[PDB]
Write a protein that binds this ligand. Structure first.
Ligand SMILES: Cc1cc2nc3c(=O)[nH]c(=O)nc-3n(C[C@H](O)[C@H](O)[C@H](O)COP(=O)(O)OP(=O)(O)OC[C@H]3O[C@@H](n4cnc5c(N)ncnc54)[C@H](O)[C@@H]3O)c2cc1C
Length: 577
């Protein structure tokens, strides 16, 4: 693209929400759309990206920003990690995520009204949660009612294309779940989600569904990959965003201008950073790095909220995990790889996550004196999920998962199950994204502030106990567990579990909230129409606008944010739509 070029709409960051907004705005073939993106433009040519079973190998690949991130910062414990994975490619993090497609709980979204008004509640958002996807049930295994989750969009979704060898695994896990007295549930898309489910996935016919499917074959979209954003171009007198400045691989600085609006979609970590480099952020933070303050927006980079997870691995009887087929070299792997390279069939096309649990653990919490005190102190309401939403998302990954064992080696033998104990309703205060400098090529400093509140530790511990009770005592699956890896979970000692939760936890990969939607600038950074408070012609569309983190994996809500952003943009530009 030519330096100085004008487009109707400029999307900064071709990620999950960015391409959604851009692709929807290009549906008038006369509207010009530009996308600037730091990573490659051709993710559909990359086997590791398009192949679902390769997803975990994308950590630390060239497609991963590989941020350093402080996981917990308590007086008694602190840990910083690398990589905290985020997609650096067209499609953003939808090009390297673990595929689960689940909206969340109606009570949670209804509370967004405090920030976005009544249009950001469950009932009005349901269509936006479905518009991006086209639902498939080719083997006709599930209720026809579930067709409603696909509104016809360009992201193909389906129930997991089940691995045949894992059917005994699935049957015993189901038997064990029911034997614990917890429900089975298949419709988790109407606002309720209590039980164990067959998850849906951004996978179809063994291929990853990435947001890049929004912006291909559209001559009115100009895609400029391999450029790094330097700054938003702001006119102070007009209080107007004009466009964006980027740096190319050759080190040249380019200006691109929007004649209607700029949409910032750089994700939860780079969106607040780019805002701050451009003069929009906490004035004292800006001054400390030599950046002039155009708008004192105290919430930029604040309210960073993510789901903590404590994963654990069990060695399981032979044939009840996929390690021997996909993780280890040999004839079995060669065979399924040959099949996949010819027609994309076989378990190489699997995301390896097929059953997902959304329990409450009230009976576990009630055994802890400190939880009981805290609930009574909250007037008798559960501090985590007072409106009946889940406490956990339990991903039962049917294999050893390196992306969930950050400090342990891969076992050299045996089949495994990786359980991701993902606390979806934490009550710890949020962390923050802050500037390290005015350098656009340095990462922001990132603190997730997991487990600031001791109660979240108590919950995560009990979520681990629930999972252990399920797998070691639950019927059918109890006969499949061979050992714990890499050592025993110290569930018999609360004091050791305290250390175990802090030292073994990680991000469940759901960061949100750093430019959140709100009614005014004293509450957040963008307004209910996703416009940056104090700036004209600037919207934000990505996970950073999310004001209350959903009760589950978040990609479904992120697409919805993009879908709604595009609709509100179209409604304002009547002369083009
Ligand atoms: C490992 C992993 C697994 C996940 N698994 C799941 C799952 O199973 N289910 C689920 O629901 N969610 C999952 N997620 C979360 C989900 O993928 C993300 O929350 C979502 O994709 C975020 O979308 P976004 O548009 O806000 O940001 P992103 O998709 O990250 O888009 C940001 C884009 O901006 C670009 N960009 C950033 N900074 C710059 C810059 N300075 N210059 C130029 N371009 C820039 C990036 O390269 C990227 O393309 C996972 C996330 C990760 C990291």
């Amino acid at each position: 693209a030519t330096d100085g070029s004008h487009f109707d709409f400029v999307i900064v960051g071709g990620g999950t929400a960015g391409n959604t907004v851009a692709g929807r705005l290009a549906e008038n073939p006369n509207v010009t759309v530009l996308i600037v993106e730091a990573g490659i433009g051709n993710p559909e040519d990359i086997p590791e990206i398009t192949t679902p079973s390769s997803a975990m190998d994308l950590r630390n690949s060239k497609y991963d920003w590989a941020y350093k991130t402080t996981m917990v910062r308590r007086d008694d414990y602190e840990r910083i990690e690398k990589p905290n994975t985020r997609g650096k490619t067209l499609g953003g993090s939808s090009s390297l995520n673990y595929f689960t497609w689940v909206p969340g709980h109606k009570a949670t979204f209804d509370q967004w009204e405090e920030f976005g008004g009544k249009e950001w509640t469950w009932d009005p958002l349901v269509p936006y949660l479905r518009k991006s996807a086209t639902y498939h049930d080719d083997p006709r295994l599930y209720s026809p009612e579930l067709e409603k989750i696909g509104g016809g969009g360009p992201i193909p979704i389906s129930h997991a294309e089940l691995i045949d060898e894992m059917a005994p695994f699935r049957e015993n896990l189901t038997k064990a779940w029911k034997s614990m007295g917890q429900p089975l549930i298949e419709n988790i898309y109407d606002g309720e989600m209590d039980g164990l489910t067959h998850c849906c996935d951004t996978i179809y016919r063994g291929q990853r569904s990435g947001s890049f499917l929004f912006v291909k074959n559209k001559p009115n979209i100009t895609i400029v990959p391999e450029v790094h954003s330097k700054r938003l171009i702001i006119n102070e007198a007009d209080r107007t965003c004009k466009g964006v400045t980027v740096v190319t691989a050759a080190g040249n600085e380019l200006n691109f201008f929007a004649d209607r609006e700029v949409i910032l979609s750089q994700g939860v970590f780079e969106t607040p950073k780019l805002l701050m480099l451009s003069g929009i952020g906490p004035t004292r933070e800006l001054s400390r790095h030599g950046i002039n303050t155009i708008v004192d927006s105290r919430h930029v980079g604040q309210n960073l909220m993510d789901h903590p997870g404590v994963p654990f691995v069990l060695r399981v009887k032979d044939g009840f995990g996929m390690d021997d087929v996909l993780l280890r070299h040999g004839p079995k792997r060669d065979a399924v790889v040959s099949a996949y390279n010819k027609n994309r069939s076989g378990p190489v096309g699997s995301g390896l996550l097929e059953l997902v649990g959304f329990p409450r653990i009230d009976k576990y919490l009630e055994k802890d004196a400190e939880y009981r005190k805290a609930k009574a102190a909250n007037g008798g309401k559960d501090p985590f999920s007072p409106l009946g939403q889940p406490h956990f998302e339990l991903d039962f990954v049917c294999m050893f998962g390196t992306a969930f064992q950050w400090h342990f080696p891969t076992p050299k033998t045996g089949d495994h199950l990786t359980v991701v104990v993902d606390l979806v309703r934490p009550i710890s205060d949020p962390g923050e994204v802050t500037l390290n400098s005015a350098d656009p090529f340095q990462q922001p400093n990132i603190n997730l502030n997991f487990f600031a509140n001791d109660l979240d530790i108590i919950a995560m511990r009990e979520g681990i106990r629930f999972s252990y009770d399920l797998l070691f005592k639950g019927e059918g699956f109890k006969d499949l567990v061979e050992s714990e890896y890499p050592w025993e979970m110290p569930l018999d000692s609360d004091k050791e579990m305290h250390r175990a939760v802090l030292d073994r936890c990680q991000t469940a990969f759901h960061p949100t909230g750093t430019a959140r939607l709100s009614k005014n600038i004293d509450q957040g950074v963008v307004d209910p129409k996703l416009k940056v408070h104090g700036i004209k012609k600037l919207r934000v569309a990505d996970a950073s606008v999310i004001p209350i983190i959903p009760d589950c994996a978040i990609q479904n809500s992120v697409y919805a944010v993009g879908e709604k952003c595009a609709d509100m943009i179209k409604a304002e530009h009547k002369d083009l739509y």
